[PDB]
Design a protein around this ligand. Structure first.
Ligand code: SF4
Ligand SMILES: [Zn+2]
Ligand SMILES: [Zn+2]
Lengths: 105, 444, 364, 122, 202
């Protein structure tokens, strides 16, 4: 896994971001003391031994136990997905802006 | 549980329900595969080694084959029947007049006793048709495809009325040598398909069968298909979570394996439903490519149909539904007492075919331009086996041996299987001492 | 009377030297008017008399229920104290009753037509079987003015009618891909889970850069099962489908040609002529197969088409589209599954019918 | 074969995957195009190796240098700008960490996919 | 040897989209003699026989304009020549529309190829459909072609091949001259391919 970790003023949650899009992820700063460090916001990030998780929900209406191989009783298939992984093994880097190289309380 | 529940609780196993012949007991037994096992698939017409090469016909050659059939048959009959000559069918003349032709329907489907129509060969009568009727006549039995001689009185030309219907003739059976077949008693069992109650996939009846097999040690058994019907509800909803050839392979492997114990021969009769095998007729022998090498000595396939030779005795091997079909069309004026079966047997005898019904039933596809050269009766045979959907029975008819074995599994319930004995004498007599010794229809 | 006299004027039209344009014009306005004058119900029942003959007792016919007139004989001899027998005729008409039954039996003596209420004499049938076919016999092969056009002058009932084409004489004038197939039957498919149905026409599913493989996702927007993962099940239907097409052919119907007679049977008669054999009734006409082998082979090509994506993939022009889609989702697995089913099809036709031409008999 | 358009890794037969490893072939980096036919001797064929491919890998231990005897009349296009500009890093990449060559090809692939994922919109 | 080409290059629905007005403008520089002369004719007459249009008609699908647009074009050229504004619906326009319908497949659903406007369809008196280089009698045709401002030497070397009864090359040399380019770029077989070329060079 690799991308840039970005937050949003509209989902207020993790999102691994790339040109192709984004994904909801779940960092873990180890020993149940999680990340409060906001410098990692908007930076290149990488991880290897991860967990990819999917959640399945369905609107089933099966009548009995001998039609369990018979299609008539299933309508909605909602699918959630997200990444779960430790921060303690993070590979990190900032973005050197590729360019044409008192006040405040 | 629910598979074979209604089946496994049968109360009739081993029960001898009907049989015929000399006196023979219960504990039937044979020499397994001991030595003298005469076996061959004969034929001056070949026995269908390979496959066809046909998916398309050519019309006028059909006419050709119809013709050749009509001609050859008529000629061979007229030889014996010492009659002079027939008539171009449209020169009306009020005398006795003998005609040759084949019978057919005028209309779409079935018949009556008032719509038989006749058609003649290509040559003898210039090839045209004439309506008929037989009201004046007395006793007949007709059905499409059937070629026959007739006699009537042609008044108007485009009409006629019958006077008489001379009788068909069988050919003399194989009259074999007198040094080869001097053999002993012999047991053969046989059973058709399908192979379950039409809701499961268990082959429980196949288990019971192979049990009986291992029990009684037979010379050779032969098991008609169709080992997986298509009209079997479990299939035509596109259910089975598998390929098909695989299932064929499995439900063959089980048989060959369990059998290899009791050292007996097996031969297979394919039919028109084992969906992995294309549905044409006649049928090439099954395909198969994984033999326990030591058994290419024992088990051989055959084509559908075929004609097999054991100890110099003959067998007609059909995997059709013939008897039901011919039941579905025939007409006979006879109304006092008549075994419908006996008659249809007598017919199937003489026409040299396996399917003299023509036009064919709305499904039982065929293809003449090989059918005539691959599956015509090489000899009037001795024993004939024929599946059905009709109640089992057995008949000795005019030096011919026939048995309706019935099905194995009548829908969801028990069924039948056929068993018989063979031996030939070693002197003269009525010259056709039945090589069939005695026959038992033993219920499952 | 209506059909007979209509066609009689039709043929009478050609019998003068007006312009081909005048020919069309006159043979057009009259047609449209004739269609409408009943299409808006403005002609008496007297103008539809259907007198037909009789040969035997009504029950004699092996069509106990399968002629559009014998049913009335059944009626007349089973309902009243009035006899009808050999050598008699029936002056009836076909009449809809709003009952979605065959036209084979909604036949009626018109005296009840003028009596009851729900006896709606069917003014649909009387076009595709009385006016049109009569006009076809004669007016058809005129230049430009072709079959369906006549149809679309009276009643736009094309789809059903579209199947009739006189499609044996298109030789007087090598084919693009699709309309080598168009008139075949598509591949329909049952979904194993969502319950819906599908149709599999071309490998790619539609639009350009968006294009995706057929077997990927069930069509029904919501459900998310992916039918590919049921290759084997598809396999089944494939065979369990083809094993009825062949079923038809070797059982091939036989049908008539002279566009009036229209007989259907199988008992091949024995006389012969240039084109082949001759109907027994319309002794002045040929006979044709129904499922012309050309169909059968066409259809099997149509199957083998949409399972062999490899070809259509290779024929694709734009580099980047090809590379991107292949990068996307053409594993060895997906490919292999196509390969499997396509293989089943192709071998099952090339088994033995038609792709061969035995040169060893063609140059002797 | 134009394997890495930026780093101009080039092979013949379409199927002799080849990379000018150590030659500082500045001149042979903005010139080539399909239509050139050249000569060569004694360069390894890597097969029965796998790990990336089993194709006829060409490995130039610099014994038989490039043998220029032909050109290819072909003017350039208009797109390579976004898909070739900047491969200079490659030039020391081998000399960077003494790169094994199957490793080298794998790394090139990784860089391909990277560039697809990030460069240059970020 | 009949009315199929090598294959259907200039078939249904190839590259093209152009508004009505421009047609005439393009005519003077892009219409192969057969078409060009027929379009002049219908520019004058504003009426045509039963068969005639069924060449020009399908030829227009060469550039492939929309029916209602093509219908509008033909309407202009119809009622200005006094064709009853009610007949149009149930008459010509009807089949003109159907020309993109169900049946017509390989009969109407296709454009024409010279080997269909030559080997058949005899053109009758005062009519215009049909290959000039075949049906137009020689010296009348000489002055006729010359009326396209052509050097008589080209006309002569052309009429030579014309009596050599091989004509495609004649059409070819004509185009070669009238655009002066010293390669034919191809071996012409279909007027619409000719058209796609003539538009290519612009
Ligand atoms: S090439 Fe044929 S269609 Fe074209 S202008 Fe010449 S004769 Fe007419
Ligand atoms: Zn679904
Ligand atoms: Zn007829």
């Amino acid at each position: 896994l690799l991308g840039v970790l970005v937050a949003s003023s509209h989902k207020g949650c993790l999102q691994l971001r790339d040109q192709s899009g984004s994904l909801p992820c779940l960092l873990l700063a180890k020993h149940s003391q999680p990340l409060s460090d906001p410098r990692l916001i908007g930076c290149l990030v990488r991880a290897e031994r991860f967990q990819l998780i999917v959640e399945r929900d369905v609107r089933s209406s099966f009548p009995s136990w001998k039609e369990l191989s018979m299609p008539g009783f299933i309508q909605k298939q909602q699918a959630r997905v997200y990444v779960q992984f430790f921060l303690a093994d993070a590979l990190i880097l900032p973005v050197p802006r590729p360019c044409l190289h008192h006040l405040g309380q | 549980a629910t598979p074979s529940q209604k089946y496994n609780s049968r109360s009739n196993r081993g029960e001898v329900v009907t049989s015929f012949g000399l006196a023979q007991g219960v504990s039937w037994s044979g020499r397994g595969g001991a030595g003298n096992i005469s076996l061959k698939v004969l034929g001056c017409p070949e026995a269908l080694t390979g496959s066809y090469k046909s998916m398309f016909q050519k019309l006028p050659d059909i006419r050709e084959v119809l013709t050749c059939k009509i001609e050859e048959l008529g000629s061979e009959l007229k030889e014996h029947y010492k009659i002079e000559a027939f008539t171009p069918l449209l020169a009306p003349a009020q005398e006795p007049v003998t005609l040759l032709g084949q019978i057919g329907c005028d209309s779409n489907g079935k018949l009556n006793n008032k719509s038989v129509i006749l058609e003649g060969d290509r040559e003898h009568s210039s090839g045209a048709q004439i309506p008929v009727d037989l009201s004046e006549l007395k006793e007949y039995s007709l059905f499409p495809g059937q070629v026959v001689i007739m006699e009537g009185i042609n008044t108007t030309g485009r009409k006629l009325v019958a006077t008489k219907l001379y009788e068909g003739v069988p050919l003399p059976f194989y009259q074999p040598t007198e040094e080869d077949a001097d053999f002993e008693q012999s047991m053969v069992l046989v059973a058709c398909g399908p192979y379950t109650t039409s809701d499961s996939i268990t082959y429980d009846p196949l288990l019971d069968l192979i049990a009986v097999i291992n029990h009684d040690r037979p010379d050779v058994c032969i098991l008609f298909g169709p080992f997986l019907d298509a009209k079997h509800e479990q299939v035509e909803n596109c259910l089975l979570t598998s390929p098909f050839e695989d299932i064929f392979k499995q439900c063959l492997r089980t048989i060959i394996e369990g059998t290899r114990s009791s050292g007996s021969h097996l031969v297979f009769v394919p039919s028109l439903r084992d969906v992995h095998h294309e549905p044409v007729y006649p049928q090439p022998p099954f395909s198969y490519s994984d033999l326990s090498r030591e058994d290419k000595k024992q088990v051989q396939f055959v084509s559908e149909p075929c004609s097999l030779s054991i100890n110099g005795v003959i067998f007609g091997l059909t995997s059709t539904d013939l008897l039901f079909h011919l039941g579905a069309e025939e007409i006979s004026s006879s109304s006092g007492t008549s075994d419908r079966f006996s008659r249809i047997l007598k017919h199937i005898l003489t026409q040299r075919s396996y399917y003299p019904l023509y036009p064919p039933q709305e499904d039982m596809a065929i293809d003449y331009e090989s059918f005539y050269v691959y599956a015509q009766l090489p000899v009037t045979p001795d024993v004939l086996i024929i599946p059905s959907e009709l109640r089992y029975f057995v008949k000795d008819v005019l030096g011919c041996v026939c048995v309706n074995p019935g099905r194995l599994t009548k829908g969801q319930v028990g069924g039948t299987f056929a068993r018989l004995y063979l031996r030939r004498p070693a002197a003269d007599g009525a010259e056709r001492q039945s090589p069939c010794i005695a026959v038992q229809v033993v219920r499952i | 009377d209506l059909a007979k006299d209509t066609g009689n004027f039709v043929i009478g039209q050609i019998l003068s030297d007006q312009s081909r344009d005048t020919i069309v014009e006159n043979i057009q306005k009259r047609l449209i008017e004739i269609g409408e004058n009943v299409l808006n119900g403005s002609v008496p029942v007297s103008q539809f008399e259907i007198n037909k003959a009789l040969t035997k007792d009504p029950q004699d016919y092996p069509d106990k229920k399968s002629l559009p007139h014998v049913h009335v004989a059944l009626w007349i001899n089973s309902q009243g104290g009035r006899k009808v027998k050999a050598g008699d005729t029936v002056s009836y008409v076909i009449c809809q009753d709003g009952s979605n039954l065959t036209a084979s039996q909604r036949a009626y003596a018109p005296e009840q037509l003028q009596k009851q209420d729900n006896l709606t004499i069917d003014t649909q049938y009387y076009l595709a079987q009385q006016i049109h076919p009569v006009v076809a016999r004669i007016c058809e092969p005129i230049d430009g003015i072709d079959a369906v056009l006549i149809a679309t002058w009276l009643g736009l009932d094309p789809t059903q009618f579209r199947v009739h084409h006189y499609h044996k004489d298109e030789e007087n004038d090598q084919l693009t891909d699709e309309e080598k197939y168009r008139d075949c039957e598509r591949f329909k498919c049952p979904c194993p889970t969502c319950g819906t149905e599908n149709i599999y026409d071309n490998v790619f599913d539609g639009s350009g850069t968006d294009m995706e493989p057929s077997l990927y996702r069930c069509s029904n927007i919501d459900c998310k099962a992916s039918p590919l993962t049921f290759t084997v099940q598809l396999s089944n239907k494939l065979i369990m489908d083809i094993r009825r097409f062949i079923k038809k052919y070797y059982d091939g119907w036989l049908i008539c040609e002279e566009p009036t007679c229209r007989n259907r049977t199988r008992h091949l008669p024995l006389q012969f002529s240039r084109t082949g054999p001759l109907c027994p009734a319309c002794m002045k006409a040929t006979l044709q197969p129904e499922y012309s082998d050309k169909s059968l082979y066409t259809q099997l090509c149509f199957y083998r088409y949409i399972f062999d994506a490899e070809c259509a993939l290779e024929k694709l022009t734009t580099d980047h589209e090809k590379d991107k889609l292949k990068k996307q989702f053409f594993t060895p697995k997906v490919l292999q599954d196509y390969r499997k089913l396509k293989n089943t099809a192709e071998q099952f036709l090339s088994r033995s019918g038609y792709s061969e031409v035995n040169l060893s008999k063609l140059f002797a | 074969g134009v394997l890495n358009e930026p780093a101009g890794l080039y092979e013949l037969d379409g199927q002799l995957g080849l990379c000018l490893a150590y030659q500082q072939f500045r001149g042979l980096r903005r010139v080539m195009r399909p239509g050139v036919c050249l000569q060569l001797q004694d360069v390894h064929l890597l097969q029965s190796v796998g790990g990336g491919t089993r194709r006829p890998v060409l490995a130039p231990c610099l014994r038989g240098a490039v043998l220029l005897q032909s050109f290819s009349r072909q003017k350039p296009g208009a797109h390579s700008s976004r898909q070739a500009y900047g491969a200079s890093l490659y030039e020391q990449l081998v000399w960077e960490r003494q790169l094994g060559l199957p490793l080298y090809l794998w790394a090139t692939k990784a860089l391909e996919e990277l560039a697809c994922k990030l460069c240059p919109h970020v | 040897s009949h009315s199929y080409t090598g294959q259907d290059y200039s078939t249904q629905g190839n590259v093209g989209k152009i508004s009505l007005d421009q047609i005439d403008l393009l005519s003077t520089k892009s219409f192969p003699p057969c078409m060009r002369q027929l379009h002049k004719a219908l520019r004058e007459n504003h009426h045509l026989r039963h068969g005639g249009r069924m060449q020009y008609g399908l030829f227009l699908k060469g550039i492939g304009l929309t029916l209602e647009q093509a219908l509008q074009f033909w309407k202009q050229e119809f009622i200005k020549g006094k064709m009853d504004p009610d007949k149009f619906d149930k008459g010509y326009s009807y089949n003109i529309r159907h020309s993109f319908g169900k049946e017509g497949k390989r009969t109407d659903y296709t454009p024409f190829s010279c080997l269909k406007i030559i080997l058949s369809n005899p053109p009758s008196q005062g009519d215009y459909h049909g290959c000039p280089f075949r049906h137009s009698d020689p010296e009348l045709l000489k002055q006729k072609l010359q009326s396209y401002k052509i050097s008589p030497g080209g006309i002569s070397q052309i009429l030579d091949l014309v009596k050599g009864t091989h004509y495609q090359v004649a059409c070819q040399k004509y185009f070669e001259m009238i655009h002066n380019v010293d390669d034919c770029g191809f071996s012409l077989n279909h007027p619409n391919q000719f058209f796609c070329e003539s538009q290519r060079i612009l």
